[PDB]
């Protein structure tokens, strides 16, 4: 499909970098009993101290070099403390009497790390690696980690690694290199070894989602988004459909079309399909929230204490329910058919737009009364909720940036988790562990239901004085599921990184984890 | 006209029902002289006490049913009381071993009710109406009304008791059921009758209006309103005459015009015109507001300056029309009334007008448009214009103009600002008789001064001056230049908050006033 | 107490009305008698949505009967907490009143639905002179929602009037008709208690603040200690001095009236095996201090609702008095006063527990005093610390004003509270300490921050600050600031005292007997 | 701009000396406020850290 212009100088697709420089890095597992080599590049201790607070170092495994190992002794280790985060370089020659440079990094007094912890010492790690010419990465594992840690390790290590820069023109980074070789040393090495080209497809799908949604406005749009879709569908050979507006409304999407009524981009409905070769025992749709841009609408004179939307990052859902196909069509699972949607559109201001007041119908039948077009999020959710049921799927999973208000329940490290069903939220948890994506579960209060009675319509988009906007939300987007199992995350709080001022990525491992142990 | 759209699941006209469960009910009023009988459905008292505050129920009328009779003793019913808005039901067998339901509604204890009491017992009685299957209802009245009163009760329990489904498909109300038949007791009955096919007149110009305002903005557009015009006059035979931006654009309507520019619909000026046969003794233009929906226009970035915050911007048109059709099925004697309203969008887009604009009025005055959230007046100033231009003897325009009208006067009673003592005083007295509140409210021409323009003719707005509602009149006084003219306010009075639903306000006003003559003759 | 015609005391009624009303509870298998009063018949319609009315119970009365016949019933539906009841005469010739209450079309009622049915049978009673209600459950109720059927009855139909003297009846027979009615007579008499527990807290809620101060207030909790032996303390300002209370002596530096620390304690007679401290946020008056320039906003004045929901449910454990526990209700109760004295954004204060804390907002004055009553709590030498405080507005937009949430740092605890809250029918949900949040209250130069300067998760910052006045206990934290007030009803709930006294009896619940 | 660090000045230690050869110094940036420390031992066999900023 053809992008629309306005000026010649507008871009009309989305670049994306398939094969990023952590693809061009070469990793291999050792197993510790065979001893540490050195030569060449930065090799790195993990080394921890468990009881004593900021206890010394004491570097524990066997090194293949003379003179490296006399340099590591423990009376010349003892002066420094393995408080976590902490880093030092040491400079040395080796056996062939050759500069080498080694160091370690402090990993706390906790025995058993934590995400969180592990995650603080992949930075420290990526601080060395920055600013230092290197060509190959030697990491020691002197600390207890399971298979679990350890992808989690590799996949941070390589997320945060790569740098963005599809958009930089005169200000690339003109020092930064990439090591082209990475080396771990830990026990058990055959066991680990099945973790590294997993954890390198975790990575890129969850890069994959990052490059969507810090793709700019200018560059990212309906039409460009779902050429995008296309072109991943048939890089890993999935079925895909492209709804365009003439059959969206021969399903009736009032409240979808509604939403994209003032763009200069026409609606576009995103339907990629993984279907496994044997028996189907499982069958998934994935629903992601995908505003290319959200203007507000016409919600220029909102009453005070109107539901404020200051979260920019719309279409996050669509990007890790995309993030997950890449996931997906790369590892290929067996007995499950999954269906990936996105209801994407622009929410834009024009003399097209819709109002609010408007009453429009969905697709299920239900008329809806407007009383915010800011709220265009679960209006495109309600009707891509009915495309999903439609499909006869056993569980139907939206994730969205949906309400603000999520800030003030759970913050921006984890995510909220509503549903109709049990069994189907005690899933979503378990993948939230698994995948080292926190998620904790909140109550679908049908005592607010009440405040959704239209008096013209058969329901309220929004509420006009309840508060709990994720639950109302929530209450809303269960009028569009009848009699299948589904499960609504909220990631409004936890799509955007502040502090690094780029994305998370966050859904794609979570949504990967739960379709792979289903 | 053809109604534009974007997508093809855009409505293109606005769903109105002319024949109402309302239209069904066949009323009967009886003389309380002769007893009141008791046979079916439910049969409810209107009772009060004068002076003793609460104090108990006692029927007064004669019952021509044994069983009904001393179920009603005084001893039964001291357990309750007459507060305004109680309620009580009966069930008993009456002489013809038949299951009755009577009841009461307490009206209070003092003998003369208000507008706002009487609308508290009718809301009681709907209560009981409600989530009950009669088929037939019966008033008693126990308590004083003179016949305007009368008439007003039956409006109002005619309109709230309607029920507006028209945007329900799956949440339509299975148990709703609707009266066919309603009998009323009352003492001097045959002075009662004539108001009661009134009174449904009356209903329906009320839930018209109603049913415009509450029409959603994807169904009610400039195109789809004037249509429903059209069809309103084409039922009634009704002169009417549509004008198009063309056409405005000779008139020079260019306030009006600017309003609508960045409207996907384009500008309709509504002209319906009731004649009587006979002579023609009076000329009335009734001009209304007719903002089908209010964006703001370029108003995003406003000094830390007034707020619009009410959001039923063409109330006045629905009231207009809604008192077209009260006009054009009563067929009043002696008079000639112009239904007027310059209908438009005023939305945001390349094309929409913006603040610091300096635009031309018919009437050749030039405005620096200060605000374009201040839409209401500017679409008023080329109405007011056109009207004079139809050489009337009285124009008076209704319109939910300035928010401050809620800080003056509240949802209860509209204010009237004119440049005619004469005029006001006949909107006065209409408020009166048709019960629909309304206050005067004084044209301070000190505040004149604040309108200067230094580029322009005249400010569209004061940059200080808050008294907003007095300040809108200012500017409108600027476009009536020799004809009695009076303004009505309904800001704060067009919407029921509490029901979530528009109150119709003005359709049974301006029909009282239309009626001024006829009302105030020696025939009457 | 001092004054500045200022009243020395907070006014309570406990003889109410509600302690006159007569509960008899027959089985529904024997038919029902209408003779008297008010009958109510309890229906659903699980099939139809809004369906119609159909009574199921055989009543001993022809002309009653003819009137529950189904051809009648028919003309009225179920919708949940629609009503109606018609006046008649019976086969006596006497006068009597029946009707029903829509029950809706789901079998199983919430605690929320049975609210709305509670409150369309309270509309009638306010509404009827009445000497006798009858209600029939021809709906399914478990043994603890039929008691909250009768705690919220109770307590909806009680008004408070104390504060009126021009602006100024009530049934003496409850009747119920219930199937195997014999296993619900026990709760008859335990939801009497809970009920005047629950209005117990509302009437000191509901007191005005020129009433309620920390004199008065502590000297209520006295007054009730006295009437239920249990034993008490009231701690001033030179004890709290001595224990070094400096956050909770900080908040009240400014205030006419001066702290006053609650401590009730009730002791089993035989063994005691579970030792627990309930512990209410009890700011009397909240000015908000010297936060002129202010960003978190703190706009709910119901700041002693905690205080208020322990005290209540010192009523109902030393009424009930339940065995193998001792239980200590303590409350730091103080005002939050603007004046030339009161303490100021940028102190620095030493706690009891030797932390200093950085004041970042003198408008968060409730963690303050907390932190010092939890440091109390914990040398008491207890299993469990339960803290119940109007804490953070925020929890308006996480859970509303239904459920209130519960941190804390033991499963095991939380766990227990969540079973106390399906028991008392008091909705709660569990939400989480994120601990990735603790940097945000590192100092520059004290020892911890009271507040966060950028982080909007206020409720979990507020439990992460209270978890560092908790070294070694299981200790659990609700934030009712959602959930104390009833905005639609302007008047309080009442919220905690069920909860509280249904944890207290969680071993009872779960001991052998 | 952000040009690789090379040392001018004479250390009088050998074995540091050796540390700070273009060749391996060229391995970092003058980026302003960008540093690297590094342990080593001297010509007396006594632990230093040198480093640029
Ligand atoms: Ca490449
Ligand atoms: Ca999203
Ligand atoms: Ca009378
Ligand atoms: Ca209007
Ligand atoms: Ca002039
Ligand atoms: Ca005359
Ligand atoms: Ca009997
Ligand atoms: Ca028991
Ligand atoms: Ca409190
Ligand atoms: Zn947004
Ligand atoms: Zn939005
Ligand atoms: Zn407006
Ligand atoms: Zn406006
Ligand atoms: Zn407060
Ligand atoms: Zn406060």
């Given at each position: 499909s053809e992008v629309p212009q306005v000026v010649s100088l507008d871009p009309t697709s989305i670049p994306i970098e398939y094969n990023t420089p952590i693809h061009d890095i070469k990793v291999q597992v050792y197993d510790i009993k065979g001893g540490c080599n050195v030569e060449e590049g930065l090799t790195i201790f993990l080394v921890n101290n468990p009881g004593k607070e900021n206890g010394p170092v004491k570097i524990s495994s066997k090194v293949n070099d003379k003179q490296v190992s006399e340099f590591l002794k423990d009376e010349n280790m003892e002066k420094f403390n393995v408080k976590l985060g902490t880093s030092k370089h040491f400079y040395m020659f080796n056996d062939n009497k050759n500069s080498v440079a080694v160091g370690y990094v402090g990993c706390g007094s906790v025995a058993d790390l934590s995400e969180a912890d592990m995650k603080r010492v992949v930075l420290s790690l990526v601080t060395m690696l920055h600013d230092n010419k290197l060509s190959k990465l030697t990491v020691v594992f002197e600390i207890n980690v399971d298979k679990n840690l350890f992808r989690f390790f590799l996949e941070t290590l390589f997320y945060e690694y790569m740098t963005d820069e599809r958009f930089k023109s005169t200000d690339k980074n003109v020092n930064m290199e990439y090591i082209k070789h990475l080396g771990v040393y830990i026990n058990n090495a055959d066991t680990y070894k099945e973790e590294v080209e997993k954890a390198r497809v975790y990575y890129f799908g969850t890069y994959y989602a990052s490059q969507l949604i810090a793709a700019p406005s200018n560059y990212c749009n309906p039409v460009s988004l779902s050429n995008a879709a296309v072109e991943l569908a048939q890089k890993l050979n999935l079925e895909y459909k492209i709804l365009g507006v003439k059959e969206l409304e021969e399903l009736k999407m009032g409240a979808y079309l509604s939403v994209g009524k003032g763009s200069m981009y026409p609606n576009k409905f995103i339907h990629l399909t993984y279907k496994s070769k044997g028996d189907v025992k499982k069958k998934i749709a994935l629903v992601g929230k995908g505003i290319t841009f959200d203007s507000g609408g016409y919600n220029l004179k909102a009453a005070p204490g109107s539901m404020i939307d200051l979260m920019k990052f719309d279409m996050s859902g669509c990007a890790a329910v995309l993030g997950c196909a890449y996931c997906v069509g790369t590892l290929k699972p067996e007995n499950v058919e999954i269906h990936f949607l996105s209801a994407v559109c622009e929410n834009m201001v024009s003399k097209n737009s819709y109002r609010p007041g408007d009453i429009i119908t969905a697709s299920n039948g239900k008329t809806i009364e407007v009383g915010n077009t800011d709220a265009e999020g679960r209006l495109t959710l309600a009707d891509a909720l009915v495309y999903a049921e439609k499909l006869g799927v056993d569980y139907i999973v939206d994730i969205a940036?949906?309400?603000?208000?999520m800030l003030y329940s759970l913050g921006t490290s984890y995510a909220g988790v509503f549903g109709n069903n049990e069994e189907l939220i005690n899933k979503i948890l378990q993948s939230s562990k698994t995948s080292n994506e926190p998620v904790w579960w909140l109550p679908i209060i049908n005592?607010?239901?009440?405040?959704?009675?239209?008096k013209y319509a058969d329901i309220n988009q929004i509420s006009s004085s309840v508060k709990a906007s994720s639950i109302v939300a929530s209450l809303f987007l269960k009028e569009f599921v009848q009699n299948t199992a589904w499960a609504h995350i909220d990631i409004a709080g936890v799509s955007w990184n502040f502090k690094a001022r780029k994305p998370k990525g966050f859904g794609v491992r979570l949504l990967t984890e739960f379709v792979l142990n289903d």
């Open positions: 940036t949906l309400t603000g208000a005592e607010y239901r009440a405040t959704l009675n239209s």
